[PDB]
């Protein structure tokens, strides 16, 4: 039997944060399931590319607005209560209005290695600056 909870996995190394999303992972290889289980945040404003070659992944998206552009396909608008599944490794486009909360599913389970690699990701345009430096720290 598996217990956790997402307050706990926030702000810890199974949060896994970058320029595009904040990956919040649930269920991971080692927990053995046959997939992983993720919650993750794309945040507002940007945009990022994926192309998954070696997996499946289904997406539930039960928060925000944006949209998903298939490269070679169609654009489906992003809201809550929509989901898509890449069965066919489809190359897309990833792109977030306000924060979006996606529920996803992995087959097979990504790796730590794949997620902190960005293994199928590559994000294109970050959010707008909160006025920030890296050598200022006032
Ligand atoms: C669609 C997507 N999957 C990744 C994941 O759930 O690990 C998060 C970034 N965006
Ligand atoms: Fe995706």
Redesign the pocket.
Same mark, same amino acid.
Do not use: D, Q
């Given at each position: 039997m598996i217990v956790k909870h997402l307050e706990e996995i926030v702000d810890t190394k199974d949060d896994?944060d970058?320029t595009?999303?904040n990956?919040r992972?649930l269920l991971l290889t080692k927990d053995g399931m046959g997939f992983?289980l993720?919650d $993750?945040l %794309?945040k507002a404003g940007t945009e $990022?590319l %994926?192309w998954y070659k070696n997996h499946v992944?289904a997406?539930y998206c039960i928060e925000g607005e944006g949209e998903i552009e298939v490269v070679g396909g169609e654009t489906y608008p992003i809201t809550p209560g929509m989901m898509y599944a890449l069965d066919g490794h489809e190359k897309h486009y990833?792109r977030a209005r306000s924060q979006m909360r996606?529920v996803?599913v992995?087959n097979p389970p990504?790796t730590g290695a794949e997620?902190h690699d960005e293994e199928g990701?590559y994000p294109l345009l970050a959010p707008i600056t909160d006025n920030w430096s890296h050598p200022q720290f006032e």
């Open positions: 896994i970058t595009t999303w990956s992972r992983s993720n $993750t %794309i $990022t %994926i992944e997406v990833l996606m996803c992995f990504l997620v990701t």
